[model samples]
Target: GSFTMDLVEEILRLKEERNAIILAHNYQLPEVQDIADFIGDSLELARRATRVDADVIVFAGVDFMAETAKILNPDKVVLIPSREATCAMANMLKVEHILEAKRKYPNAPVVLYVNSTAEAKAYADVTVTSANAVEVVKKLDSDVVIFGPDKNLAHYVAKMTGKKIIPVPSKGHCYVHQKFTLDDVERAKKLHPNAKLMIHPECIPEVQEKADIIASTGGMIKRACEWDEWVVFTEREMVYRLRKLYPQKKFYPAREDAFCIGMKAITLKNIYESLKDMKYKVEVPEEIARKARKAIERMLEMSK
Candidate 1:
């Protein structure tokens, strides 16, 4: 995530002193995410963090990811590339917002998506991924569930499971996915006949209605192998990985400019600086990690 001129080698050298491993979410700038040692969903990275051995992890995604790397590897220094790399949807759902919803739906379980912050996740009865939200919520004994941060996801989960999902924040969203308009959806359909409009659940309900398969970024990747070709409706960079992941299969984005500004905030400029000084180090305050793990574990156990 640096200038082609010289920052790469210096940053590479800094890795030796810091034992730094770079992690990125695909939504990030290609220069940043592609140069990263590992890249993908934050939940996926969190699980991997538990196994990796490093002195520090420079996570080049949004702030939600920084805390997670810190949570799983409390012994290491976890840093974000930039302060501006803050997630919109995760920050939209405040801890108190869900707490107020929990009060209203006393019997409803709080099925939190791991895209959330550590503080918000601390109060969760359990956590779920975009891929398993429907299945996990369906497993809940209660007919009602409080799902947060992504109103579209909550709506989609309710649609799939026939459960009453109460979204804590009225307007939770992934700004990138929200860019795909009804016109864009039509453009893809017209450009490529007989291709499913594969979209992420973070998309608006109007957009979701046109999608042939509504799923997470990872889900769409796996499903890519099954289809001949598909038009995507998530972040535009996602198509970049999809094309690389399945070069034989064609992958196209509904819109060329579908990108998250928060993700774009991370440049190699900051990634190089992140490992050098390790500033913006993500610390859990332990309070959240202590309870967050307990809360996360309960969902895994409960789901089993």
Candidate 2:
């Protein structure tokens, strides 16, 4: 306990010394969340990356998240606490896949998830966040759209937009979310009798269809405030953030197995050690960075 306690103290001191800001995704460990200066989704991080005057951004999420922040604010030196932290979903969508998809569906615009690599983003016509994917896809002028790195969310868009949604990579999914079977949804309801069943759009289409509330992590947080309790189905650590926010209410993760390996790869020790010595600064190549920024901006303009 003292070990972790001392680590927090050291991290705070170093953060002050270096003017570092810790940006944590909601799906991080509870201790990791506690230390975060800003906690939530990547767009929040992207906005904070530009707004904050911090010299260093210590990202407690995965690689693509840190890379996204770096792409947004070139001035801030972004650091990922653990190079071990990598999202399989981010790696799933590559430049080749995007190039091939665009060629095959020549008229269909590419609207990829923000959970993609810089090069993939550069190739995309625009990027969409999980929260706004449905809305953004609805507004796009095309009847067919190529979305990727998350086939479940792609399907969700298809249902919502009534458009011919083409999921690139055909089988891309989050390892953690893919584990949430339909059986687990039933199991969650049995446990929480009165609680509403909440699942991310990232879940399989079956689970999404069965879910009581289908929203992104951002939407989930806002809805969570109005409602008292839920049987949640995102990464289990997200329950930590929900519980932390609404301590009096009950929030149960649908399944204990619903956890992200990459997110858990980070911890207090990683944060402390990384901050103390300034480790693993992420870089987006200049050529790719500008194109990536343009795609992100296009999404921003189109979303609203």
Candidate 3:
């Protein structure tokens, strides 16, 4: 059975009938992007979930993204079209490990990346989206900050803030970003000598050093548009989104294979059926949600 134009229309209508707001990531299929009321990174989508009045949040991304909505709007129902869709990188850091870090750095404030689980966020002093990580971290009054689940991002923020960031070695990492080799960056540089290479901090340290601009996915897009010279992007397949948005800009991906399979699991059918059937709801343990909210609230306060 082929998914036709009519199927797409039906899904959109079903989503509307359910009063569901579709939040999609940049790496989603183009149709998922088109139908989504809001298209952004996980943190951006999380922020939107806080303000949305919809009865249901039909997350068109991964489990972490849907879970984020549940964390922000505990009262509203949240749904992921595919329950099996998971991020290996997002799951790298566990709650117990974060707690251990907390015990180790009692005086340090915790700054969790939005890529973390709700359980981990509960232990954090605050949470930061990759887009606003630097901005959020700078506002923390604590001398030391704990950043986790993504060492590359932590290192990037440490440089940006000049703060003593306690880097916890996290198993979590974007597989796509991790796939980038120093050789790929060298090749990119060789191919586009005039362009500045902007790589996500989620990349390996070797790749990070080669980047002229090390930033979050959203930040990379912003820099891509503003910079007049040629640009190379190293992250997920979502890099295409930036290129599409900035047609005049010369943007090249660091590696062709850096694409998130988890992010790609989302389809228009998954979204349509999830809303229509009200299936795949994520329920966090109340105790866990409460704890996670504290960390997230702390981040929100600092972010403001």
Candidate 4:
């Protein structure tokens, strides 16, 4: 069992007393997102952290998103309620290995996914979110490109750009998306032929091939709201947020495991008490932050 409704309300009240800002990813539990000050994708949350005026940042998402908050705001205290939370796909590669690869292909420009760690991003030329990765990679005038963490996403971008994308040896993948099989997609389409089916490229190529629209969490949300028609989401916990916002639109999930277990591990009490006591704090080393900021800054420049 988790925190009771009354307890959850108490926690939110306590959180306000601590001058904390709650930022959650779209994949977070609906209750978590409900109490959050803002809910967005990785890049969206990073940008939100900059505009926030608070003493503490409560990230209700994966470890990398919280780490990014720490990297961006070294002065402010950042906490991830569930420290065990991790993105399997994000952990596929290390900075050292990427550095080694850089040596092997000195001519290749590194284009990292936003899901990577600050340390890994430090070694990257620029960071790109799933939505704009194609644009970011294509903008690079280099003949060869290095992309990673998620081989599926890397290959998807590579095929789109017709560039020689050197995917890292690691094959980090999202379990939730990976669980989405071709049959699941066909089921969704069969159940709602009129509904538009969308998927994240992190899924297998077969599933991605069936998707009517391929997008990131941010892009999916935008696309969903843009159309009043029903939509089937192939991403994790985002269905809750989508349904909450668009009650008129019928939203279906691609798989039962679309709820990320890591995301579900966070409780309202974890968020509330963390702010009240300031118990857990996430701090990135200054050295790593300095290098990580460079890669992220390069992405912002490219975004403009």
| Candidate that would win on lDDT | 2
Off by over 4 Å in 2: 1-5
- Which residues of candidate 1, in runs, are more than 4 Å off? 1-5, 298-304
Worst 10 residues of 4 by lDDT: 227-236
* Residue 268 alpha-carbon offset, candidate 1, angstroms: 1.1
Best TM-score among the predictions, by candidate number: 2
The whole-model lDDT of each prediction reads 0.81, 0.87, 0.77, 0.79
lDDT of 2 at 66: 91
lDDT (tens digit, per residue) of candidate 2 on 91-197: 99888888888888999989879899998999888888888888888888899999998989988998898999877787899988899998898787787778998
* Candidate 4: clashing residue pairs, number: 0
State each model's C-alpha RMSD to the native.
2.8, 2.0, 2.7, 2.9
Candidate 1 yields a Cα-based lDDT of 0.81
Stretches of candidate 4 off by over 4 Å are: 1-5, 231-233
Summarize candidate 1's per-residue lDDT along 56-168 as a digit string, tens digits.
88888878777777777778888887888887888888888888998888898888877788998888887877777888899888999999888888889999999898987
State TM-scores per candidate.
0.92, 0.96, 0.90, 0.93
The lDDT, on a scale of 0 to 1, for candidate 4 is 0.79
Candidate 4 residues 1-304, lDDT tens each? Answer: 9856586777677667878888898887778888888998777877787677988888888888888888888898898887778887788778777887798899899888878888888788888888778888899989789888788898789789988888765676777777788788778778878778878888888778877788888878888865565445455577788888778887777665676777776777787767766866887888888888888877777774
Which residue pairs show collisions in model 1?
A: 1-268, 2-268
Stretches of candidate 3 off by over 4 Å are: 1-5, 169-172, 228-232
After TM-score superposition, the amount by which residue 239's alpha carbon in candidate 4 deviates from its true location, in angstroms, is 1.0
